[PDB]
Amino acid sequence: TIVNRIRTDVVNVAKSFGAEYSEAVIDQIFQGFGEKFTNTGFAIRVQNKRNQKVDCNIRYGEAKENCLAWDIARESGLLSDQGHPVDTLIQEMFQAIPAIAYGADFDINYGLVKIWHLPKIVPVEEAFKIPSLPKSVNAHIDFFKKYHLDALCALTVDYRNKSTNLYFDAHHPEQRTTQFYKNILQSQQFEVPSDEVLEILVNCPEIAVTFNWSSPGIERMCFYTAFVNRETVPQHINPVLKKFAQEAPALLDNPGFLVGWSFGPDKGTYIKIDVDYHGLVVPSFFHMHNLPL
Numbered sequence: 001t002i003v004n005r006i007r008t009d010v011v012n013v014a015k016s017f018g019a020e021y022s023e024a025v026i027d028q029i030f031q032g033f034g035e036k037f038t039n040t041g042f043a044i045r046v047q048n049k050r051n052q053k054v055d056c057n058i059r060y061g062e063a064k065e066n067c068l069a070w071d072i073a074r075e076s077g078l079l080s081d082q083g084h085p086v087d088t089l090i091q092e093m094f095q096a097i098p099a100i101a102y103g104a105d106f107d108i109n110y111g112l113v114k115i116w117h118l119p120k121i122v123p124v125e126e127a128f129k130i131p132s133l134p135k136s137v138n139a140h141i142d143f144f145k146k147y148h149l150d151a152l153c154a155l156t157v158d159y160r161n162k163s164t165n166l167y168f169d170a171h172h173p174e175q176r177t178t179q180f181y182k183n184i185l186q187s188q189q190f191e192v193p194s195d196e197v198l199e200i201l202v203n204c205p206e207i208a209v210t211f212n213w214s215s216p217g218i219e220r221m222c223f224y225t226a227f228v229n230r231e232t233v234p235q236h237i238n239p240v241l242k243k244f245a246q247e248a249p250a251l252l253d254n255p256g257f258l259v260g261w262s263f264g265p266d267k268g269t270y271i272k273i274d275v276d277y278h279g280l281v282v283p284s285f286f287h288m289h290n291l292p293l
């Protein structure tokens with residue numbers, strides 16, 4: 001079956017990359033969501049957040065108007081009460097902004113980590129009326145304006161990290177210059193990457209900003225870049241990129257990949273890479289940012 005092939009590929013990724021994982025957690029996740037993984041925008045992610053350690057997440061999105069993952073996880077026990085503002089945040093999001101898609105993210109050592117909300121691109125102001133958002137979000141209004149973070153294309157709730165992300169379509173011409181990325185990173189006293197990386201960031205169609213309930217500042221931000229196949233991934237920049245690009249499983253022979261370039265105070269600076277397991281994620285990314293496939 002597809003679902004068994006997916007589960008096998010996921011375990012094999014975790015073994016090959018030495019990622020921590022729990023067979024019992026994988027069982028919970030697949031009992032809840034394995035069918036969803038066979039039928040929708042599924043991806044396997046590795047990232048190198050922690051020191052000399054790769055973590056593995058599995059994720060999916062589908063074009064439903066309602067947050068089916070929240071219902072499945074609550075009914076399944078994969079999502080329990082947190083005693084925290086995250087408890088209702090997803091619900092608020094779907095009540096406050098119409099959704100054209102949803103998705104969910106799972107750490108295979110843990111369980112459900114995040115749920116997300118994909119509306120049509122709307123002005124970021126529509127987020128400020130979500131009650132349970134951390135206060136730092138509405139406090140960054142002038143920040144969003146200045147850096148052309150006006151076109152909100154997604155929201156995520158991170159139940160494990162106790163954080164939320166706002167995602168922006170990076171449509172503005174200034175976001176086509178490297179000085180934009182040096183500026184936006186410097187404004188938070190984040191690490192500035194090499195010139196080559198910056199030359200990669202100028203093409204990014206999507207910028208994520210992470211807020212939390214423990215500081216008034218931005219926790220991290222992330223720049224997403226898609227690549228149509230294994231070869232066009234900048235494999236020379238980091239060994240995890242090379243290895244995952246060359247060895248990641250998919251139901252296609254030469255699948256595409258989504259690379260997130262994350263930046264923070266220094267931790268927060270690292271790479272994430274997702275394999276387009278079914279071939280749907282990358283055309284979705286381009287289409288959702290009004291770009292030719």
Ligand SMILES: [C-]#[N+][C@@H]1[C@@H]2c3c[nH]c4cccc(c34)C(C)(C)[C@H]2CC[C@]1(C)C=C
Pocket residue numbers: 041042043059060061062063101102103118206224258260274281282284285286288
């Ligand atoms: C395209 N797409 C959306 C997501 C997405 C947006 N940006 C990303 C950067 C990195 C990774 C992903 C995404 C994932 C794999 C989570 C995508 C899954 C399909 C979505 C939900 C559309 C139906």
Ligand SMILES: CC(C)=CCSP(=O)(O)OP(=O)(O)O
Pocket residue numbers: 103105114116154155156158165167208210222260272
């Ligand atoms: C990008 C779409 C909205 C869902 C992906 S959630 P993410 O990978 O950006 O979340 P992290 O900040 O990396 O934990």
